[PDB]
């Protein structure tokens, strides 16, 4: 499994506290993580949480990451931001049953959390712990057992309409404001972490074109 | 200011607890509300989380609802559903700030809600007391208040990027399973509320056809 | 109806942020509010979370006080000092329904709060929600209303056991480290706000002795 | 490490539930659960929130349990009334951050927990990550580090004033109702346990006298 981590301009100063509770989860259980930031440092590429969500897209969609871990403030926007393109089931957390239960009963590839609402002292402790739960068992498997089957059909009956609900991303990559897709993508990082990963050869042709 | 309350199939006994916060409220601030169920009713027609989110994605974009409540067991399914439509701006809150934030950062038009998940002693407390602060403010004006432009233009520029990236809502109801959007506009009182209230008389006209006039 | 407010040393500079909240709502209210600090000032005597349990007991004890807000970074160690010594019911609450049904099932006379966990955007709108949820309605009405007179009961059943369980206050005061005791009551405002509401002679006489008049 | 487990009336119903996460926890770290009760089962001996601070005082003095889990409605009953006596250090917890800190913060041998007020689907998933957070390391380590020796020291010094403010448990089990302390230790299983894991021979000999 392939993890990236994904902060905005906000919360940027806690992306090294983040991706220390994220490695040491993702290497317990053999996982490979990347930090596409931004990470906290002065005159570095920005984010918003709208870029955020763009940017999870893409990584999702072309294969770069199998899962995708982001936020904001109070990990709404970021959420509502990801969830506006196709491909992507973003879900929220605050505590760790919260990442259990979105594991199990919605079995989506993004979630959005909040980095300063509730976010004090042992905040840390609570994403260790959130991101040890939302790994602990295969997603998808339903909680309790006796409600695994009608939470795993709407699942499915979801993706269905989603199906229907999106436009075709690359068409959507090609729509959106250029500007704002190359900033998007202008990470320190980005070029060698999603062409090394990526799995769709024709988002990989787009973005190149956008970056040279 | 109209606000719907959808319940799904799981927590629908639930249903009058949640009306019964949302109406007092609504009732002190001189809103209306319009309970579309489900209601925890034996034999009537079911909504899953799924379905919510159609239904919240009609009421919203015929202008039939100005603000729609929904959820279910944990309240991440019917957010997930009401935000793969158009027109749908859906948070959570678990507690009374996380609602009021939502309004003052995001300013949406929907909030799913857990109904079982975290739900006990004093959880009816907790329904009245957020859906009091999710509407103490004019929405949008933006927390830590400094925060406000950023937050605004971020809400601004999501809406920009909706529009490229969602089909027409009405497209989007004629290729849907027509089985499924049926049983999701089939409440006891759907017709009622949704004809009285509607705004849009595409969505009407073809909602008429779907249920046969 | 005369509340107190006591910061120890770690959440010293979090003192005007509660305050603000704790002074608005009581206000509103008609109540007073008697900061007691600490109050984030450099060079300012100091205070444990242990030290404010004793500072409690004495303003609670001595009529000083009715109601006593304190805490601490997670709240658990000021209400487990509160707790140690007679006439004090500390609760604990981190969200508005906490602090209500504190004031309902338990109807104590202090409540401790987490000010560092937890404690990020919008804790002050937590802060003042709480407040006014604690100070809602009547104390001791219990909940679920039905469960008030088992309620009511186990409360006084508690004070019962209480009157056996703990020395005299007095005789803790003469009997705890001296030193310990002075710098608890030392605060720049501790003789102004102690001495004017003290319903307690003797232990306002004692403590003058601690003092040296 | 020996653990109990005390249940007043109005949550008799969930003891089961909360036993077997207690249980889950307690196996796989090789400790000692006792379950005291009350069970959930018709016409069994009763307990109030007050009578559960009294057991929790009569088995952490006694020895014949070095932690106890208890709790009511919304945990502040409990935890008040097991805060009443001399060598008790009860906490509160709601999710398993509180849990672990209280462990490394306060070091106390008690936790009371709401069992009705934000305890619905899940909440014994809720049971599991917070027992498994308030035994993950040993009690009273600290935390931070850094803020470590500020909080054991505390912790010592609220040690040593409960030695002045609370009076002599046995002159407190000689003073109170009779009837009360009866019923307290009426429990189906109560002397069974009790008695093979007292290790105060003063407590064990007047509660002796009390029931025969």
Chains 1, 4 share one sequence.
Request: net charge negative; charged share 20%; proline share 2%.
């Amino acid at each position: 499994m392939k993890i990236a981590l994904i902060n905005e301009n906000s919360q940027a100063s806690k992306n090294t506290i983040i991706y220390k509770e994220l490695k040491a989860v993702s290497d317990e259980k053999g996982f490979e993580v990347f930090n596409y930031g931004m990470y906290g440092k002065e005159e570095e590429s920005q984010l918003t949480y709208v870029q955020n969500g763009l940017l999870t897209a893409i990584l999702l969609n072309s294969g770069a990451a199998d899962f995708v871990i982001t936020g904001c403030g109070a990990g709404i926007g970021a959420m509502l931001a990801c969830n506006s393109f196709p491909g992507v089931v973003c879900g929220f957390a605050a505590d760790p049953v919260d990442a259990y239960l979105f594991s199990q009963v919605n079995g989506g590839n993004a979630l959005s959390l909040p980095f300063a609402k509730g976010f004090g002292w042992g905040a840390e402790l609570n994403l260790r712990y959130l991101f040890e739960r939302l790994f602990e068992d295969e997603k998808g498997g339903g909680y309790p057992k006796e409600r695994a089957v009608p939470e795993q059909r709407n699942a499915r009956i979801l993706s269905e309409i989603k199906q229907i609900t999106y436009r075709d991303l690359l068409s959507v990559l090609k729509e959106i404001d250029q500007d704002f897709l190359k900033e998007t993508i202008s990470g320190e990082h980005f070029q060698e972490y999603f062409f090394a990963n990526c799995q769709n050869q024709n988002i990989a042709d787009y973005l190149k074109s956008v970056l040279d």
